[PDB]
């Protein structure tokens, strides 16, 4: 009675399979989760000798910016279309530099997810409190390892936020000094997908007469504004155009930790604006970024898509 299904579970590998081999990667893993119920739909490791979706933890860099934006967002602090001044992409803070890829100058609150800014993620965090950021990254369930049945699950690190100094909320801000697991990272996911309340993600078929208890992490508003921002980072002027899926239209984040050896990871939903799936890979050591996980989501989502009869909705 698992929830797997054997053709998303199929479709899963087959795309994870072929990328492992494209980039001679070390390892993959893939996750393809129901929005509606929790249920995992396939759930892939790429060679198959642990369950290191489970059981392997990681900085998950950019794939937290969405989680800054939406509590501030949440805590109204900021508004989708507040102004964020990142300059030329040098910032310094308490001593410490935090640099973007590019000189991005005055974004809005959404052009920070679009331009995937760590000076304005750290801006947009330094309006919040440490007790704020640390209680919303334990309400997606970060710090805490799955209760999933699989043995020895990953609780990742969450440091306690009467110790975090500034630059370190702010580094959190931007996805480095916590560690998780893709598991976590799909789980969260799905609070921005199922309308702000992230769902029991389980491997068993959900009973459909009984009631699914999750927990509201965001609200309905909240996760509607982040959904449409997650759209544009594989839109034109995003920096993830290759995890666009043709005839759909998608939104999610790339990040990445480096360990030359380094993880690629991409989390992201489909199809806005009312997902159906969230699908979670990532790419262990190939041998950018994006450019490695990006492509594998696309696969898996629109195959997935496809598989399942859900119409296009997105002119090719």
Do not use: C
């Not at 508003?221 to 544009?232: F, G, I, K, P, Y």
């Not at 989501?297 to 119409?311: E, H, K, Q």
Request: net charge positive; glycine share 10%.
């Amino acid at each position: 009675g698992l929830s797997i299904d054997s053709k998303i579970q199929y479709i899963a590998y087959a795309n994870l399979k072929a990328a492992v081999e494209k980039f001679k990667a070390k390892a993959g893993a893939a996750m393809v989760v129901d929005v509606r119920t929790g249920e995992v739909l396939a759930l892939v490791n790429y060679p198959t000798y642990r369950n290191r979706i489970l059981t392997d933890v990681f900085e998950p860099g950019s794939i937290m910016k969405p989680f800054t934006v939406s509590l501030a967002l949440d805590l109204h602090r900021v508004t989708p279309n507040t102004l964020v001044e990142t300059g030329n992409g040098h910032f310094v803070l308490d001593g410490a530099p935090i640099t973007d890829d590019a000189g991005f100058g005055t974004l809005t609150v959404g052009g920070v997810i679009q331009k995937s800014s760590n000076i304005g993620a750290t801006k947009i965090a330094m309006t919040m409190r440490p007790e704020e950021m640390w209680n919303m990254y334990t309400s997606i369930g970060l710090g805490q390892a799955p209760k999933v049945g699989f043995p020895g699950a990953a609780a990742g690190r969450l440091r306690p936020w009467k110790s975090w100094r500034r630059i370190e909320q702010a580094t959190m801000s931007y996805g480095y000094g916590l560690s998780v697991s893709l598991f976590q990272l799909a789980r969260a996911y799905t609070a921005i997908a199922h309308d702000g309340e992230m769902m029991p993600v389980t491997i068993f078929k959900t009973d459909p007469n009984q009631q699914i208890t999750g927990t509201q992490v965001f609200t309905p508003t909240t996760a509607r504004e982040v959904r449409t921002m997650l759209e544009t980072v594989v839109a034109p002027g995003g920096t993830s155009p290759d995890a666009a899926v043709p005839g759909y239209r998608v939104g999610g984040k790339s990040g990445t930790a480096y360990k030359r050896k380094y993880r690629a990871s991409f989390v992201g939903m489909a199809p806005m604006p009312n997902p159906r799936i969230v699908v979670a890979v990532s790419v262990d050591e190939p041998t950018f970024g994006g450019q490695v996980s990006g492509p594998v989501f696309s696969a898996i989502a629109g195959d997935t898509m496809r598989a399942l009869n859900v119409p296009p909705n997105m002119p090719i």
